[PDB]
Design a protein around this ligand. Sequence first.
Ligand code: HEM
Ligand code: HEM
Ligand SMILES: CN(C)c1ccc(CCNCc2ccc3ccc(N)nc3c2)cc1
Ligand SMILES: CN(C)c1ccc(CCNCc2ccc3ccc(N)nc3c2)cc1
Ligand SMILES: C[C@H](O)[C@H](O)[C@H]1CNc2nc(N)[nH]c(=O)c2N1
Ligand SMILES: C[C@H](O)[C@H](O)[C@H]1CNc2nc(N)[nH]c(=O)c2N1
Ligand SMILES: [Zn+2]
Lengths: 411, 407
Amino acid sequence: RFLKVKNWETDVVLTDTLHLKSTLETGCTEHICMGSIMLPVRTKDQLFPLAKEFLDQYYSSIKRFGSKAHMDRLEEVNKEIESTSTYQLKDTELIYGAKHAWRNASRCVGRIQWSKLQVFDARDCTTAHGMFNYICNHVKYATNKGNLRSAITIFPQRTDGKHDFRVWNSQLIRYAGYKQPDGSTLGDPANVQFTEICIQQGWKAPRGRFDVLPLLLQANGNDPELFQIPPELVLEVPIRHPKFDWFKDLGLKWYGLPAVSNMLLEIGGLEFSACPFSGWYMGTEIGVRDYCDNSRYNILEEVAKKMDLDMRKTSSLWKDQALVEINIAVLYSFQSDKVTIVDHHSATESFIKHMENEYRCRGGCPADWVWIVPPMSGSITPVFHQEMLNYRLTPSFEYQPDPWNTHVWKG
Amino acid sequence: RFLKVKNWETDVVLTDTLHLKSTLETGCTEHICMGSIMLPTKDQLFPLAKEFLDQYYSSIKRFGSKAHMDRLEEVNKEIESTSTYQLKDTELIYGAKHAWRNASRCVGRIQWSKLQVFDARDCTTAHGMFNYICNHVKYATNKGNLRSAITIFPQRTDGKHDFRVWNSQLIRYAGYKQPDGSTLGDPANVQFTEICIQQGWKAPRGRFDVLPLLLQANGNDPELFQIPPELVLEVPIRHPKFDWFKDLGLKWYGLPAVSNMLLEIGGLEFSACPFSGWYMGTEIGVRDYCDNSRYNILEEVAKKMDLDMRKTSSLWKDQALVEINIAVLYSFQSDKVTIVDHHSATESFIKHMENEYRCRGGCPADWVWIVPPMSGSITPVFHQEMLNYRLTPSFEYQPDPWNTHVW
Ligand code: HEM
Ligand code: HEM
Ligand SMILES: CN(C)c1ccc(CCNCc2ccc3ccc(N)nc3c2)cc1
Ligand SMILES: CN(C)c1ccc(CCNCc2ccc3ccc(N)nc3c2)cc1
Ligand SMILES: C[C@H](O)[C@H](O)[C@H]1CNc2nc(N)[nH]c(=O)c2N1
Ligand SMILES: C[C@H](O)[C@H](O)[C@H]1CNc2nc(N)[nH]c(=O)c2N1
Ligand SMILES: [Zn+2]
């Protein structure tokens, strides 16, 4: 079956055959679309077909499908599964797998970069101190003094579900949030629960507006342990505006490295519950969501006051005016400090080219419009006008529950 | 089977039961979501009539009454006899209002119950249609104090006697392709404009030429009529800060009046059912003015603002976009023509959603369309999970008449 998608601005029509390779469910049915819903122990039974599907993919990609090396690998994996109930990926397969999980991430606008990903194999790691060391190295490598490089660090896979490696932080670098007795929040409201956990675990909070959170690291199903990332490895950018000199006085800064550390990487039926990865920021992540979300730093008003906008009526679009200048400031600040960042115009323009390339060479490109379209200036980006098909391919990154909700405490 | 939607900004959770009454299909499957795709007999008829009459009589607290059963058998008799049936005025009004209520792509639905329904089922000719349309236009425009309305022409019979308005909106600007290669006026309306011209329209070949109506009655060939200019309320666009803005020569019309959709009620099809409300500012400022395939004036405005258009990272497009939308809202408000900004409208819609979940068990909503085309995440709807499903009565798309018309 062939599915077509149209760009209504260019009239470019693309044909998707790749969706036929999709096995996982979407959440939607013929009777309901759940496109805007945020989030809608394994036996050898189901494991070998998942292994086999993956190895077929891997061997095709290297143009060795049906080769003796291919057949021997399947044989080897089958025996390892049936005798040990799981299996180990080769380094090559792991790298391929991690790149392809990124390639298949339908919510990622940055996928033009998918083939350039530094894979750090941390499957020999056994302790939290070991994890801390690997994470420091990842951060140093990825930061590269401002010339950001995409990377992922992969810790040992799940076994019985009782010995999971987990990074309890949602991102490797993130600011603390503190609920005040008066109901207000100091720092990042998104991180209040996690901050409370760290504090309970013994973290001494400075209690400021931009305190880099400690790492809370779980190796092999043991209770998680606290580590402070060397401050010298945490690159931060003071936010100023190229025209508004009062902007610096808002006291804003942000960190340079976005490094998501709470997702699950699935490759060939194997589950990597700790696989922190990092690229670089699109400006709106910080300027629109992090700064201007009502449930985050929420600085729109303070900014709009300082610009002396008419704030009596929303129809002045004071919020829209303030939002733009803030986003200008984020981009200006990162560029001036030579920290990698991309604006949403560049990023979405590159995504369209990527997506067209993928349709040609791959027969498709799963894309979640709801997430690909930037949170400001939507229709003046080309992706707004692009029809997209969302489906699930493996390897993939998946959500997993927060570890404090499932962890069995050892004491 | 009972579905929850969450608002991630306010933590409000609503439970949807209304989707279970859904009948039509979405285009999506368990294996693929098509949420971003723009367009994904007597025996057929009586269950449809029945489903509709059931909800009608339930809405007036007479479910399972004598009058309900009576109406049900009367319509039943009429279907067996005539192969169709006719809605009572009360049923027609209920159906039209609910078609709007059910329009998952409409952010303005808090107004759904305040709709003026004009019954034009007695209409037989294009001149008749013209008259009804002028009346609609005058009524809805109301000297700038806009009122929602729909005019309903006779229903489809055998598909050979369709009433159709060929225009996509009652009021729209012409588009002409130049020898210069570019496009004068509205590029969206190039094809329709040509059809007017080959049907006899004498175009002024200007930038903002109000198109003439092309009206088809009873499956006959369509005819041209000029809407009396005096009924077409237009707004010169100026900026409350930039004096040069007026020099751009921009204007827009006050009345958004969609005329090409199909209204389905109780299995009956109304192929000509133009309706109108009032504008949300971004439709004009963001889409009409800034879309590349529309009037595409961003560059010109940016230049007038003297912005650094060297690099995209200066966000000059975003700066210009905001000012354009400021001008639009400012101009309409200054001339006392009803308009709503995207902040006010989405905030209203959140309240409507909660009303509908509370009083009806749900509200079908298409996030891709409900989230405005600028400043998305600073409006509440961005953080609102929505379930999209198809309820009837409904407004549907239908093919452009010129591809279907046996001339
Ligand atoms: C290199 C530059 C990159 C850019 C500019 C970029 C951009 C983005 C953005 C803006 C989002 C939306 C995030 C949000 O709104 O929360 C996203 C999502 C995502 N990205 Fe990328 N990304 C990059 C690299 C990567 C890498 C290296 C990976 C993995 C190896 C990745 C995997 C993902 C995944 C799995 C999501 C979905 C997250 C979720 O569902 O919560 N991205 N990306
Ligand atoms: C009264 C003020 C109203 C406002 C502010 C409003 C707002 C909107 C907006 C912004 C859209 C998106 C349209 C687009 O982007 O092309 C829309 C779509 C729609 N509206 Fe409303 N509307 C109003 C009145 C009405 C009325 C009176 C009806 C019918 C009786 C209606 C039925 C629809 C339908 C069926 C759609 C989907 C159009 C499509 O699928 O192409 N609206 N509305
Ligand atoms: C629970 N809530 C409110 C919630 C949780 C996660 C999300 C999405 C987090 N996605 C973050 C994410 C993931 C991968 C990325 C890759 C690159 C980049 N620049 N940013 C990236 C950002 C949204 C809401
Ligand atoms: C096929 N293409 C290019 C295409 C067709 C229809 C559309 C959407 C047309 N619907 C416009 C529309 C419909 C109903 C409305 C009701 C009120 C209002 N203010 N605007 C309204 C605007 C977009 C693109
Ligand atoms: C409810 C809605 O799905 C939710 O707010 C989504 C919308 N689109 C998004 N898009 C991106 N990139 N990131 C997000 O967090 C969200 N949030
Ligand atoms: C491809 C995509 O579905 C298309 O551009 C949609 C996106 N959202 C929209 N939303 C509204 N309100 N109106 C539109 O025309 C569109 N266009
Ligand atoms: Zn869907």
